[PDB]
Structure 1
Amino acid sequence: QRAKVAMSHFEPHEYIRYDLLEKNIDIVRKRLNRPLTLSEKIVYGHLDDPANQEIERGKTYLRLRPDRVAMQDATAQMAMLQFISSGLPKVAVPSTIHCDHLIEAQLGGEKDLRRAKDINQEVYNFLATAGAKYGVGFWRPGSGIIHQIILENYAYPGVLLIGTDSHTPNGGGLGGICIGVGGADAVDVMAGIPWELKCPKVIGVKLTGSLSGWTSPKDVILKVAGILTVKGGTGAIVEYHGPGVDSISCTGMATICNMGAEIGATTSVFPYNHRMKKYLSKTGRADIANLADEFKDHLVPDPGCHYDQVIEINLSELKPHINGPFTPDLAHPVAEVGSVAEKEGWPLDIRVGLIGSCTNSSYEDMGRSAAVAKQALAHGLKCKSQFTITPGSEQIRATIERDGYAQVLRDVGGIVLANACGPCIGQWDRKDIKKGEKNTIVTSYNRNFTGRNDANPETHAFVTSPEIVTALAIAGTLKFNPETDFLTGKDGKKFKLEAPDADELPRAEFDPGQDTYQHPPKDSSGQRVDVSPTSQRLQLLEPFDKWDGKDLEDLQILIKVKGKCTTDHISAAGPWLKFRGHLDNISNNLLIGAINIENRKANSVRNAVTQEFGPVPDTARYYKQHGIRWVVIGDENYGEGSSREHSALEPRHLGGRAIITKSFARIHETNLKKQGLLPLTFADPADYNKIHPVDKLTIQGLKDFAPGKPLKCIIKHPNGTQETILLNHTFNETQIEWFRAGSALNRMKELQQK
């Protein structure tokens, strides 16, 4: 580039290329002759061939070149095992591993981390020596959650980042396009080959007016999530714009982009502005803010660009929301929630109040919560409810500890957890409740899907802002309304809580703490990564079987699924995170949470040959070792939610050939195409009703599988009648070559020594 500004302090040699962004935006622009939106300037500015790429929103696959790859340890292990199979010597672009998902919340900060490094040494040692070997930066356990460390250090305006985690959109708060992928996508960018993405549609949310009072950043996406619903953002990028953007802090925009994951959006973004500039300078990147000022025309949307849908939100009319309890789109005003809770039968007293995680742990969030706490403390009050605080990184922990906020928070009765996901992925040894107990918890997190936080099917969880969690934690009930109600203080008077007052960013500079990162040695020609042969936590992958040239005849339906089938129903987390690097050991959880439409129950399907109802993994394994190939039938938005490729690998490992649904979630359908399976959808969703558990399916037409040709499916009924239905697919020729080879990895290996 002419300027020589680095990507971050950890890669001082790898410079930001806004000169290329601009050259590819100018090549696209003159092919398209129209204003482009911000996410179009940034996506199309990273095309591998901007002169020739075919560009149509919602239709074409763009072949893109991401700037950096970030990985989290619950998904980094399988991604690094696939990279190890490619045979390639080093990673092609800046990648980092972050160790945040294997640390269980039990007693608090220090004790929980000590136990996690003991319990997990094998996997942390595997991730660091493979990181050292292949040149991947490694953030040590206890250093912080992937998105918080990415916002503090690696996101910048104009970046195209991919991450093996759904909440990777978080990065959009600093003006970049950050997309979550399954681990095999990350190994394409690390292997140095173009990354493909279905060309996004763009939803424009216009922000007008200003935040006031108890209303925070969080409220905007709780409001938008309820307007669009979980199905709302599928296949689109949400792009925030308006005069109101500049009334939100940089870490508030990151809160909003983060939860856009919850409506199925490919990612969300905000346009570069003064708030981002301020945060870039206060986090040791003033030079990035100076470069970006010079390229600002390319980091804002063109005037007059066309959004495929515009939603307008008046921030000055906005008021606090609390969303739940079993989806993030059931939206409520914090004024109404008490009411709805008594008519609906949701438990009114707040058992546990949990604040933090990467969605709501900025210096501003911790401070606004303390500003509430300090008030309750001046009246001899304490949290009525149990109270946990998870700092997003060691820098937010060291900084808020030093400036006092952490001590206010413990003085009202909260325990500070390790800087890791913990209760946000449900990695938590809970004790206050017997399992099955019906109880309400309230979090500042993002997802509140059933069983997400403690695996109690009946814990009702509500997501809101950290200050409202803190206020309701002292209150102990969903009946309390912070902005109206009175609280009875130890000295018998009544008083009411004042709306939080707090610094956006420190007066001082940020404390980073010590010992957080392991640099890779461009040295150690002689790093050795050794999966013990009979290790129960890590296992080297063995190639899947190449496609046999024939059609798929008389396939068994392992399960026909009723309703919502999230990737947590397909591959659960909780106890199974200890097997995220062992494929046959984590496959023993295949589809155990999905509801069987035959009997309305989870984990009991009928074995076609023994005629006994029993566990799905056992049955799929019975089928596999007897030569029966099977299929799953789903309803809508199948594979919704968490990014894990384990949802696609475990079907392949047990004998699965195809998943046919009315519609798929984006990251799960890419993960099925990547593992050699067939993601297919009904040309008519009503055809879901034609297929019963008992039928055998023949998927015919593979010999001339082509983009756009539907595949024909012959349903064969026990009584000899058959029906033929049509099935659509979104494969392009790159992806058909993945199916043909047995998986995308097998194909990457054929472009070397076959």
Structure 2
Amino acid sequence: RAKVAMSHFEPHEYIRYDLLEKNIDIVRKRLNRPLTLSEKIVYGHLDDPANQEIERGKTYLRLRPDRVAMQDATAQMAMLQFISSGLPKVAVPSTIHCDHLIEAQLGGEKDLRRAKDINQEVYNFLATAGAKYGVGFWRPGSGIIHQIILENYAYPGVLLIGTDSHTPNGGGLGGICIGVGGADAVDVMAGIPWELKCPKVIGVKLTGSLSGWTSPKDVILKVAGILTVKGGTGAIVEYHGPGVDSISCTGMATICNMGAEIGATTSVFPYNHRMKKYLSKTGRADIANLADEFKDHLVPDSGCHYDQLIEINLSELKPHINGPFTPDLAHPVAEVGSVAEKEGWPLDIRVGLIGSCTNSSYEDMGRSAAVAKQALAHGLKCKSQFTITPGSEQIRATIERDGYAQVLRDVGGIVLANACGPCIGQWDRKDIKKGEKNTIVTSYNRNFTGRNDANPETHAFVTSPEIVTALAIAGTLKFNPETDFLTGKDGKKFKLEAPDADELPRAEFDPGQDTYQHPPKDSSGQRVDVSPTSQRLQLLEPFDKWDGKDLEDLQILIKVKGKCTTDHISAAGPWLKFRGHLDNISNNLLIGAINSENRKANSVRNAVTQEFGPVPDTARYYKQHGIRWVVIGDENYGEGSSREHSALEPRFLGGRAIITKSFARIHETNLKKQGLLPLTFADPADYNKIHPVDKLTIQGLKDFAPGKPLTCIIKHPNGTQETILLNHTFNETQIEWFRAGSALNRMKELQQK
């Protein structure tokens, strides 16, 4: 066909749209109905399109992804599992991005130099394991994983998986990009089919066009408020309608990115002329030309059916700000000042932060510079502290060149390294004491308790970068950029004009400094060294195979009340230091979850000693003494980040099952991957039948089967027993992971030994 390479770094790996077309056509001859765009790209990547059972929301699809991307906080454990497999080389194009371990403190270059010293051992391990197994390596300072992928690797029709829940960002260039845990990434790197539950499809029809202060971020802040954090579970969100051509390619990536906060499997936009333009300005005009020849397969079929349809008229959409606490608590910027006042949320903004993968594009930086230049023209600077995170080295070099970084420094901002930084709590914040109630506004995406600075009382609101800039200049939530007046230096009241700026540089992008390291795919004689006394890296010892018996008289470690995110289960911030060391990071297990017994975090009753203490310590005591335990949770358990450490840590400390009213998708898969039993109540009111003091027996593991519930006997202390039924979503592939002790153990059994 055409021989167009997948990227500039893999000149010999060609885009297979011929394959995509062939598979789409086998499938539509079987289904005889129009296909949505996400169905075309997902079913076009089936391992066996002729025989695959296809029912939305019901069957597990066996898929062949085109490439794997990892960032350094999840790559360590994905590579330690790949090293246990014993396999010599990765089977698909794979990259590691070093963006999560650079702490914001002094700003830019200074923080990057310090991170390279402090994290030497880890950057070393990832670069060496990358060279050995054939994984491309983007060095610290290169940029945030998703901005590097949009700029270099995402293209229309790609199926990409990434070990990060904001991998959907790549949907802004028409590809299906899905967040997974490290063991799912090991499957694909090892060459075995990846399984995904066939998604439902929510269609969002965009009408009109954005104007004034409204930006792409407002579309997904509105959709999150409508669908809520659990409304997208099990579905792909597919944006369509005439309003789509009104949004820039990076704007579309912003909207797909934050679809992770409603639990969506991913989000996607159809290939159009704004994506073409972006591909050409990022050196990929040949890929835009080939996608023009396969365009019919890169847009939805006429008359395709969405399981749910939402319509948003972009011309009536006004600026939003969401939070504090949850990303679906949506408010117009015009009313947040009065709601804050009413709810007792601090009105004064201590810090304004722009960037993160969600909003760190060239257009985002130009729109923020456009607000800031107006303030400067009246002799003002930010009243709040103000930080700017460029998404990649190319964006940092280009906004530096085109003058936007200096405008942002002149209003009082500090430019941080091209890294996650304050977005996952890698921030040496000293302006508030811990426990001090305060408000920060960001252009990020999640705003869960203690995620940016480990202070539970920080009220974090997420909005667009131009509104963070306007509010940082005013210093208060009680400021609406569209209506209100600031007073300049000269005494005159003035109003901010709505920002206007170019979507892409007129000139070319300046690539900045060299940051990619290609694998020698010749030589590869690397020894990966993991010191046996390291506190940051530790090789894995395989989990135990199932004993063949039912699980009797299980102790409840904790019955959790309410929201239980993967940041509650395995916190980030300071704990990122131990992401390659399973025993050391397991000391954060469930320390943020609220115990229903006392409503406290990290205080559970030890059943033997009858002392209340830390959850990690209590789980290790039970494991030392042979007491097998269970976690009981509420709705949407495991919401958020994809970190498989939330599943590895309960397995390591002796847990056996997690029983909840419902699971977020990625965490439920990660639990199954690690040999645990994720089970849901067949009747959710049964959550109220179980008391912290009860022992539980799970029966029927011997004839464990797809679609057959398991029986749970609740043993009450007074002698009463009650039987309830528990549902599971295991298929036979997955029951094999459980019987082997983990998916990695099963894979190693298939290697004939």
TM-score in terms of structure 2 length: 1.00
TM-superposed deviation, 1:408: 0.3
TM-superposed deviation, 1:524: 2.2
Identity within the alignment, %: 99
Moved more, 32-41 or 450-459: 450-459
TM-superposed deviation, 1:326: 1.0
**Other structure's SS at 2:13 match:** coil
TM-superposed deviation, 1:450: 1.2
Paired with 2:595 and 2:4, the residues of 1 have a C-alpha distance of 55
TM-superposed deviation, 1:233: 0.3
Moved more, 249-258 or 449-458: 449-458
Structure 2: gaps spanning 5 or more residues = none
Paired with 1:724 and 1:442, the residues of 2 have a C-alpha distance of 49
Please list the CA deviations of residues 698-732 of structure 1 after superposition, one character each: whole Å capped at 9, or x if unmatched. 00000000000000000111111101000000000
Query: Residue 157 of structure 1 corresponds to which residue in structure 2?
Result: 156
Give runs of aligned pairs for residues 350-429 of structure 1, distance below 5 A.
Answer: 350-429=349-428
Runs (4+) off by over 3 Å: none
Paired with 1:551 and 1:456, the residues of 2 have a C-alpha distance of 42
TM-superposed deviation, 1:574: 1.1
TM-superposed deviation, 1:523: 2.0
Paired with 1:649 and 1:316, the residues of 2 have a C-alpha distance of 47
Structure 1: gaps spanning 5 or more residues = none
TM-superposed deviation, 1:541: 0.4
Please list the CA deviations of residues 142-197 of structure 1 after superposition, one character each: whole Å capped at 9, or x if unmatched. 10000000000000000000000000000000000000000000000000000000
Paired with 1:553 and 1:341, the residues of 2 have a C-alpha distance of 50
Paired with 1:272 and 1:704, the residues of 2 have a C-alpha distance of 47
Please list the CA deviations of residues 324-378 of structure 1 after superposition, one character each: whole Å capped at 9, or x if unmatched. 1111111011111111111111111111000011111111110011011111111
Query: Residue 328 of structure 1 corresponds to which residue in structure 2?
Result: 327
Paired with 2:402 and 2:479, the residues of 1 have a C-alpha distance of 30
Residue 647 of structure 2 contacts residue 670 of structure 2 at CA under 8 Å; is this kept in 1? yes
TM-superposed deviation, 1:514: 1.6
Please list the CA deviations of residues 20-73 of structure 1 after superposition, one character each: whole Å capped at 9, or x if unmatched. 000000000010000000000000000000000000000000000000000000
TM-superposed deviation, 1:455: 1.0
Query: Residue 211 of structure 1 corresponds to which residue in structure 2?
Result: 210
TM-superposed deviation, 1:684: 0.2
Residue 619 of structure 2 contacts residue 654 of structure 2 at CA under 8 Å; is this kept in 1? yes
TM-superposed deviation, 1:513: 1.1
Paired with 2:597 and 2:360, the residues of 1 have a C-alpha distance of 44
Residue 131 of structure 2 contacts residue 524 of structure 2 at CA under 8 Å; is this kept in 1? no
Paired with 1:361 and 1:628, the residues of 2 have a C-alpha distance of 48
**Structure 1 455/81 Cα, relative in aligned 2: closer, same or farther at 3 Å?**
same
- Correspondence 1:551 to 2:550: yes
Query: Residue 624 of structure 1 corresponds to which residue in structure 2?
Result: 623
Paired with 2:448 and 2:569, the residues of 1 have a C-alpha distance of 14
TM-score in terms of structure 1 length: 1.00
**Other structure's SS at 2:317 match:** coil
TM-superposed deviation, 1:525: 3.9
Give runs of aligned pairs for residues 621-700 of structure 1, distance below 5 A.
Answer: 621-700=620-699
**Other structure's SS at 2:558 match:** strand
Paired with 2:213 and 2:513, the residues of 1 have a C-alpha distance of 35
Paired with 1:220 and 1:322, the residues of 2 have a C-alpha distance of 11
Please list the CA deviations of residues 65-121 of structure 1 after superposition, one character each: whole Å capped at 9, or x if unmatched. 000000000000000000000000000000000000000000100111111000000
TM-superposed deviation, 1:694: 0.8
TM-superposed deviation, 1:205: 0.3
Paired with 1:265 and 1:488, the residues of 2 have a C-alpha distance of 44
Residue 550 of structure 2 contacts residue 699 of structure 2 at CA under 8 Å; is this kept in 1? yes
**Other structure's SS at 2:527 match:** coil
Query: Residue 609 of structure 1 corresponds to which residue in structure 2?
Result: 608
Please list the CA deviations of residues 573-603 of structure 1 after superposition, one character each: whole Å capped at 9, or x if unmatched. 0111000000000001111110111110011
TM-superposed deviation, 1:486: 0.8
Paired with 2:502 and 2:302, the residues of 1 have a C-alpha distance of 33
Paired with 1:690 and 1:317, the residues of 2 have a C-alpha distance of 48
Residue 133 of structure 2 contacts residue 524 of structure 2 at CA under 8 Å; is this kept in 1? no
Paired with 1:335 and 1:591, the residues of 2 have a C-alpha distance of 38
**Other structure's SS at 2:466 match:** helix
**Other structure's SS at 1:452 match:** coil
Paired with 2:524 and 2:259, the residues of 1 have a C-alpha distance of 43
Query: Residue 478 of structure 1 corresponds to which residue in structure 2?
Result: 477
Please list the CA deviations of residues 458-517 of structure 1 after superposition, one character each: whole Å capped at 9, or x if unmatched. 110111100000011111110111011111000001111100110110000001112211
Please list the CA deviations of residues 283-342 of structure 1 after superposition, one character each: whole Å capped at 9, or x if unmatched. 000000000000000000000000000000000001000011111111011111111111
TM-superposed deviation, 1:426: 1.1
TM-superposed deviation, 1:753: 2.6
TM-superposed deviation, 1:745: 0.2
Paired with 2:305 and 2:500, the residues of 1 have a C-alpha distance of 38
**Other structure's SS at 1:210 match:** coil
Paired with 1:736 and 1:39, the residues of 2 have a C-alpha distance of 28
**Other structure's SS at 1:541 match:** coil
Paired with 2:524 and 2:78, the residues of 1 have a C-alpha distance of 22
Query: Residue 3 of structure 1 corresponds to which residue in structure 2?
Result: 2
Paired with 2:638 and 2:583, the residues of 1 have a C-alpha distance of 20
**Structure 1 68/717 Cα, relative in aligned 2: closer, same or farther at 3 Å?**
same
TM-superposed deviation, 1:434: 1.2
Report how many aligned residue pairs link the two structures. 753
